[PDB]
């Protein structure tokens, strides 16, 4: 049987090389200079070089003569080894739900939270429910805002209304203030959004969830991506076993410190007071406000209308942020910095302006999500993330603050985003240097340094001795 | 504002504005010298 | 001959039966250069779209299949020299396969890909 | 150097004959030989005015390269088929 | 820039080496593209003793001079000695030339000597007739270009190489004295002319080897080509 020999080729022009060698084979197959090679292989995904099937290297060299595209493999050839010749012709070929939330990878809608309105059965795209970032073709010759169909009908351009549904500016589809447009599944980020996966790190205590090895707990020695071959050291066991990720879970007796790796709460820490079936409850270190999370890692009140951290209208003039959920009431941090107790129905849910802009103490533009330092007022010295803005008020969050679930309120002006004689030709009119013309480099209340035009020296004299030109 | 220059070849004072190619309106010569300044110069004779 | 060889890179299609890679002009004008007598796609474009593939991986310029181990592994030793495909995505309909089996030609798949 | 050594260097270089990729279907070449170098005095301007000689002081001031263009005349003679030889000469290349 | 003079024979004696005396003549044609192809004719520094070898360009190992002459075309031995010792009545020359003669009494004809040289070549041929051609090319062009590169210059190259060997023997016997390296008679000065010639020659070859590439890229398809586009005026300047 003949063997395969690597011949280096021009990149991106390997298929054309095989076509030219086949034409060269048929053009000289009856002549006195025959191509004694057997086949030519240029694969689909192997880029840069092709393969010649022959019993000899000299047959390869005398067959590729006259081909310029292989001239970097003309002098020497390398044989594909015998066990590896089948590797030449060898060809190889959850995380997303309806009403879940993803993040688009590109565009102005890059990194924005978007709800999955519809999963396409062909698995090409998903319809996404968004909030548009558009200037309504007025500024174009931005923060998120609700789609005003009357405004885009007023401005005109590419607009087509079909009731609440509307097509605009490149087949952008919108309905009832929200966008509903298909975007590719390869173009969206399906995991870690939190408006399978495995995360195990050496040193954590894990439990065996199934098997004859079930209910062993031990600490992680090492980690791999799938079958972790987690090498746990179980209690009272000096031996290392191997477990696949799917067989494990992150256990924890009550009283140990825990971190929230991913979720609405991620970054927060606490001691777990009670562990339930897959449920785990804990108290945060910043605030004693309760938390219930899954073992691998709700946030909404009973009734589903409101959720912690939301902006509410307390009365016609006063806004606040919900900072504690109770069975009949909320605790709300109002815009003045006081916490009030109100019945769930006594406050109205307020539309948050995610695209709000304000000025900080140094006249910088600040926006929601910005990190600011507090430089005046009661919270001076603190640092926080802007969560909401209203008139002269900013609601901030800092996870280190245990009070009010980390929320606090500051005035925007208490925040910050985290001589005449100089150069004037003078004439010394008194003293030992009298009559010299120079230029004032530095000047004070008393004296001034004069670069003398004549000498190579800068000397200082009194301002009472100088007379300008 | 005027910034009168001097042609290297024909020595002709010719008006040039900012952001224009260095060209002499006659003789096409492309090297220009600026001028002598107007501000006062005081030299000791030492 | 040269009539089997494709003329350009655009619209290259591999056959579903013998993995013969030609352009759509050559399938329209010549049919299959190996087994058109069993398939009869010459004189019909829809027969070509039913009997050729739009997805293929790897090409082989099979010059002498009588003394090729690649033709032994790809099972194309008893064929004619030409441009062949390594992996072919696609399948004939059941009428064509049943008609070939009634003529004594069982349809072996050229999809030799390792699907996961 | 610029009188005779450049001439001998430009003339002793062998002519280049070049074929196709040994066939097309189931190949002629040409010679392209050149000689008789020409050298002109330094010149300076490019697509903005009719070219003018470079003064060395102007080169110093404008950080130009006080260089001179050299020219050759090439004779490419090409044979294809039928035994008909046509040679085209390009002066001042 | 100073350099050692070309086409002249220098007999030196380096202190610590396997050989005592060595005669070199770096050679150049009349400003050819080939660099200084330096050839050394050396004498070992001590059985038999005092064999004469000649390390050759594009040859990995030293080659005894008599093998070089037989490869050059002199089958006999009297003819070879006629090119080295010019007066046969001097037996002191013979007593030192015979230790190199008796080293190579197993090569008697031109082709076996060509094979011997080709085996020592940097690119050893796989067959005999490839080493023959490689060594013939080396003797034709690499060795002693200044005495001539043509169809038949074997007699002139043999005369000059025998002169080099005679010069080495004169230094070995003490009839003459070793040439001085700092003697500025043996030096040459590369002024603007020669330096610009050396550099322009290389750039001109580089220009030609890209005109060729452009020509190939158009004639593989065979439509036509334009020498105006082929010439890359940037490279030389
Ligand atoms: Zn077929």
PDB file of N, CA and C in Angstrom, chain A residues 20 24 26-28 66, chain D residues 21-26:
ATOM      1  N   UNK A  20      -5.777  21.385 -10.053  1.00  0.00           N
ATOM      2  CA  UNK A  20      -4.700  21.539 -11.026  1.00  0.00           C
ATOM      3  C   UNK A  20      -3.858  20.274 -11.150  1.00  0.00           C
ATOM      4  N   UNK A  24      -3.470  18.089 -14.470  1.00  0.00           N
ATOM      5  CA  UNK A  24      -2.120  17.746 -14.905  1.00  0.00           C
ATOM      6  C   UNK A  24      -1.941  16.239 -15.032  1.00  0.00           C
ATOM      7  N   UNK A  26      -4.467  14.097 -15.911  1.00  0.00           N
ATOM      8  CA  UNK A  26      -5.192  13.661 -17.105  1.00  0.00           C
ATOM      9  C   UNK A  26      -4.519  14.192 -18.373  1.00  0.00           C
ATOM     10  N   UNK A  27      -3.862  15.354 -18.295  1.00  0.00           N
ATOM     11  CA  UNK A  27      -3.218  15.921 -19.476  1.00  0.00           C
ATOM     12  C   UNK A  27      -1.953  15.162 -19.877  1.00  0.00           C
ATOM     13  N   UNK A  28      -1.317  14.457 -18.938  1.00  0.00           N
ATOM     14  CA  UNK A  28      -0.079  13.734 -19.218  1.00  0.00           C
ATOM     15  C   UNK A  28      -0.203  12.233 -18.964  1.00  0.00           C
ATOM     16  N   UNK A  66       6.768  21.859 -11.583  1.00  0.00           N
ATOM     17  CA  UNK A  66       5.971  22.750 -12.392  1.00  0.00           C
ATOM     18  C   UNK A  66       4.790  23.363 -11.673  1.00  0.00           C
TER      19      UNK A  66
ATOM     20  N   UNK D  21       3.326  26.016 -15.951  1.00  0.00           N
ATOM     21  CA  UNK D  21       3.407  24.897 -15.006  1.00  0.00           C
ATOM     22  C   UNK D  21       3.394  23.566 -15.772  1.00  0.00           C
ATOM     23  N   UNK D  22       4.283  23.511 -16.766  1.00  0.00           N
ATOM     24  CA  UNK D  22       4.721  22.313 -17.479  1.00  0.00           C
ATOM     25  C   UNK D  22       3.671  21.726 -18.416  1.00  0.00           C
ATOM     26  N   UNK D  23       2.418  22.174 -18.302  1.00  0.00           N
ATOM     27  CA  UNK D  23       1.343  21.808 -19.223  1.00  0.00           C
ATOM     28  C   UNK D  23       0.029  22.447 -18.793  1.00  0.00           C
ATOM     29  N   UNK D  24      -0.962  22.451 -19.682  1.00  0.00           N
ATOM     30  CA  UNK D  24      -2.331  22.808 -19.334  1.00  0.00           C
ATOM     31  C   UNK D  24      -3.322  21.694 -19.633  1.00  0.00           C
ATOM     32  N   UNK D  25      -3.257  21.109 -20.824  1.00  0.00           N
ATOM     33  CA  UNK D  25      -4.144  20.032 -21.236  1.00  0.00           C
ATOM     34  C   UNK D  25      -3.338  18.791 -21.596  1.00  0.00           C
ATOM     35  N   UNK D  26      -4.046  17.673 -21.721  1.00  0.00           N
ATOM     36  CA  UNK D  26      -3.422  16.408 -22.091  1.00  0.00           C
ATOM     37  C   UNK D  26      -2.991  16.421 -23.552  1.00  0.00           C
TER      38      UNK D  26
END
